[PDB]
Design an enzyme around this catalytic site. Structure first.
Site, PDB file in Angstrom:
ATOM      1  N   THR C  44       2.632 -44.857  17.161  1.00 41.90           N
ATOM      2  CA  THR C  44       2.655 -44.809  18.619  1.00 41.90           C
ATOM      3  C   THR C  44       4.051 -44.423  19.115  1.00 41.90           C
ATOM      4  OG1 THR C  44       1.035 -46.610  18.593  1.00 41.90           O
ATOM      5  CG2 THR C  44       2.059 -46.083  20.718  1.00 41.90           C
ATOM      6  N   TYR C 107      -9.784 -46.978  23.951  1.00 44.86           N
ATOM      7  CA  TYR C 107     -10.538 -46.312  25.023  1.00 44.86           C
ATOM      8  C   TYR C 107     -12.070 -46.460  24.922  1.00 44.86           C
ATOM      9  CZ  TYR C 107     -11.901 -42.558  28.332  1.00 44.86           C
ATOM     10  OH  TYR C 107     -12.487 -41.826  29.341  1.00 44.86           O
ATOM     11  N   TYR C 133      -3.922 -51.452  12.136  1.00 47.12           N
ATOM     12  CA  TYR C 133      -3.014 -51.590  13.267  1.00 47.12           C
ATOM     13  C   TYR C 133      -3.788 -52.202  14.448  1.00 47.12           C
ATOM     14  CZ  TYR C 133       0.263 -49.675  16.863  1.00 47.12           C
ATOM     15  OH  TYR C 133       1.117 -49.461  17.915  1.00 47.12           O
ATOM     16  N   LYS C 162      -0.701 -54.409  10.702  1.00 53.05           N
ATOM     17  CA  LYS C 162       0.387 -54.375  11.683  1.00 53.05           C
ATOM     18  C   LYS C 162      -0.204 -55.116  12.862  1.00 53.05           C
ATOM     19  CE  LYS C 162       3.247 -51.315  14.592  1.00 53.05           C
ATOM     20  NZ  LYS C 162       3.291 -49.927  15.085  1.00 53.05           N
ATOM     21  N   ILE C 204       6.765 -53.634  11.437  1.00 47.63           N
ATOM     22  CA  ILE C 204       6.787 -52.214  11.780  1.00 47.63           C
ATOM     23  C   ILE C 204       7.336 -52.155  13.202  1.00 47.63           C
ATOM     24  CG2 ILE C 204       5.496 -50.081  12.110  1.00 47.63           C
ATOM     25  CD1 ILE C 204       3.644 -51.122   9.790  1.00 47.63           C
TER      26      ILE C 204
END
Lengths: 294, 293, 294, 294
Positions: C44, C107, C133, C162, C204
């Site tokens: 990201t 989304y 993640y 993560k 991370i």
């Protein structure tokens, strides 16, 4: 008969912080004169949290006396302690209230079964009609339509809801679980419009303290099915609905009334008798917009 | 003219997951025949996230071809990448769409200034009218009425909002910041009723995929000011509104259509071509309640 | 294997918005020199959402080349489209990545079963280890410890998380459902301290882009069991952790690096190549507090 | 002191719902014997919402008598009514409490300035140390680190926080605004581990009612800097932390004690004296895991 614009009355205080009984009576008389269709003394907006039991009871009695059966008195009887809610309910019934407004227990976060037990105990203790006051923004817990429907089935005197979820689909869900005859009253001024479109029949209102005539006429338009006119009232009132809640509604309302009617701004701690400049300006602009100030 | 019942069209797939063009065309024809007032191809309900660029383009083109100018086509052109949104917007314009539906960027969480820049860039790139698709439950960010009002003032082609906030006071706030002529369309089926009461003029609708006639009649009643009749439609349709969203609306809708019209339930991962038994039971009950089964 | 301070690398751009390969390579070299324990290209923070497939691939390839097997490369391969995630995963594998970072679909809001299906499909397509993640603040959906445990049981190559929930009890729950050997890495810089106390083995990290040495030493303190020393690092770094996230972390990070290392502030829309003056001032004060500026 | 494992004591009731003073005294004596480092009578876990004024006062007095200065007594003195909070504070000081636990006002949703005024008024009224009880999940409002810092600066006797935000970065923020000497105690059992890693020095604990020795040893390990050992205790206790909160913590705790020690499950409405079978199964399993049941 519980419908239309029903103010959750403020409780005016003196400079010394005592209940101002003369100011309270004057406010009630004016509310009735301006078209309010019912009265809720000592709800949240009446500062129920900072009144003692004795003061709570006195304000309910004073409201009943001043109303003189002209409009229904729906007395606040809320607590997160079931025994305390019963005490307040029994007093209001004996004093001559027409109904009770009973909040979902706050802070202690009961389960749905705990909510059912609480409201069942209150309903069993009194013969008066009860309006459930479902307000997750304050109580955190949220009475489901299923729990509400179970209460309605179990107790003939559980007759309505003051719905402050702000989720208008809940009105639709409550029609299914509780019936079309279940009395649904908005607990939010700014969405009272959509609320009645979904099947509501009124609003227990903070804004009505400030603009009782406009709020009563707004409600009348919706009861008549004239939603185009109701939207025109929303255009006139929305700035006020928003402005009085920038900070606590009690404080916004008392500021507004200090400007229009010379009301005392005094509130009890932890509410503040002051507001931010931007809040006061927005309230001033809203009052001017609604024609209540020059 | 963007008003009334506007389905966010499903994109039907074959068993293997390919776009089913014949099923899509038949769905569009039926939607128009049943009274839908506009069409949104490849919105969220059309599974925009799982279509390739070429597939997105093809479905928009096919929708335009089938509609044949009978109702407006408001093409999905959403992305969280401004460059990509512009590409999709330009294609839809060249293909002959009547307007664009442009979602707030999801996942990357831009600022209000970023939202302004995103929509301004899209608006500057095309001549078509744009409907802002504000959906905090999916995008997390929330375009404020101030930002929305600033976009309306800056760009003549920013004409409306598909408002999926579920906060009906926002309609009132947007009426102030954007004007009474700003086109507000509900992005939620279950509160389309209150939404129009607050000044909305329609709904970009998931449920219209299943009940296009009832949804069109519901909207028409509201546009006419007959809220008593609109409430009667809400009594008929609310169980369906609720049931199709117990799980993702795409999947609830495709199940409902599998029952009423023999539609394929296939969706693309991470959506599932299956539902829980309580969901299917509730949808079946809702279809019966609405008079559809 | 995967432990300690693992930067989610920024992707530097030139003034025109093109990937700056020279600046990226220099950043990776410096990160390794300063003690970073691994590398996440095109996560990201690397602006994965605004890179093309060609650019995504090139940055992954460049990261692998520059690292030269000195530290593990955990390549971003996230998408809300399962087919696209598979394509990115296979490219990274073919390119020589050591592992994959795979975000929960955003989304489109899949169910828990949809999450299972998505990660299962990616896991079956590749041989590389996968780090899940889980980031509800961006994806809205939240992979439960039960779903995560089911994935770990079903796929040997699902090896870690993560975890950007910000709920540290989730580390404890994930230890139960996924085992003590499941690799848990913080997805939040400001709670990396408590995260490792609960059983995490690294982070991370966004802040590591700015302060790789301090972040590496902070992680090393925790891996050595010296939590008193780790707290001293938290005292030094917390203002920076907070300040870089007042606005988007990418933009906070690029501002800090513009000051310390002359990095370009350019980001791709809808991220903006700027910050509010109060955010810049807070980053300035945080850099001074950390000893990175004067 | 105020450090370590500090139970928020349950208030045992008789079958008929009366405060059971004999059982309360026995519970306190056992807590002290098992190594609890302090005592909080009539907090949330003590069912403060459903105790009368008389009962609140009597339980505080009894706790002080039984403790006999062996460990500090941090008396619950919370209310959403400032005048009531002051009355409770003045009583608890007079009764001989060592400190006060003062909740943020719930339900009425004051502003930050209202919070400042509330806590300032309580602090001015007494000489005792005050621990702010910040619990957004119950009170909705959230005292900011800025407001907390302002209170600490204005009042020497505002000495610490029972922080139930569940946001561990807040500990780091409170270190900045209130200082490293500000006494931070976890308000959540499941994240007490990470909380102390961030600078906390104890936990005002629900689980300590059930497992006082293990909770005390867990806290002692963290005080000693032995976080590896603290994690072993978390492994032993986490299932219990989770299970007692599947339904309200008071009810989960009283069920657990009914199993281990023959305690009465009775609670006051709207809390329920019953739990779901799956909840009871999970608590039993957690007790067995912790070695408190066969």
């Amino acid at each position: 008969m519980f419908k239309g614009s029903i103010p959750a009355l403020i409780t005016p205080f003196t400079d010394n912080g005592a209940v101002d009984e003369q100011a309270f009576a004057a406010h009630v008389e004016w509310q009735i004169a301006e078209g309010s269709n019912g009265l809720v003394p000592v709800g949240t907006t009446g500062e129920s949290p900072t009144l003692s039991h004795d003061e709570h009871k006195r304000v309910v009695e004073l409201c009943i006396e001043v109303a003189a059966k002209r409009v229904p008195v729906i007395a606040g009887a809320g607590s997160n302690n079931t025994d305390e809610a019963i005490e307040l309910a029994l007093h209001a019934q004996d004093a001559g209230a027409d109904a009770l407004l009973v909040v979902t227990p706050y802070y202690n976060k009961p389960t749905q079964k705990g909510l059912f037990a609480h409201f069942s105990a209150v309903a069993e203790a009194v013969k008066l009609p009860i309006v459930i006051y479902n307000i997750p923004p304050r109580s955190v817990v949220d009475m489901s339509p299923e729990t509400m429907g179970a209460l309605v089935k179990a107790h003939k005197n559980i007759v309505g809801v003051k719905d402050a979820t702000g989720k208008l689909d809940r009105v639709s869900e409550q029609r299914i679980s509780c019936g079309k005859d279940f009395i649904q009253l908005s607990g939010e001024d700014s969405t009272a419009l959509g609320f009645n479109a979904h099947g509501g029949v009124g609003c227990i209102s903070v804004s009505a303290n400030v603009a009782p005539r406009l709020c009563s006429e707004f409600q009348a338009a919706m009861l008549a099915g004239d939603y185009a006119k109701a939207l025109e009232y929303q255009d006139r009132l929305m700035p006020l609905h928003r402005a009085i809640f920038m900070e606590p509604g009690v404080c916004g309302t008392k500021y507004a009334l200090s400007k229009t009617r010379g009301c005392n701004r005094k509130v009890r701690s932890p509410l503040m008798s002051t507001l931010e400049p931007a809040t006061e300006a927005a309230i001033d602009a809203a009052l001017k917009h609604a024609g209540l100030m020059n």
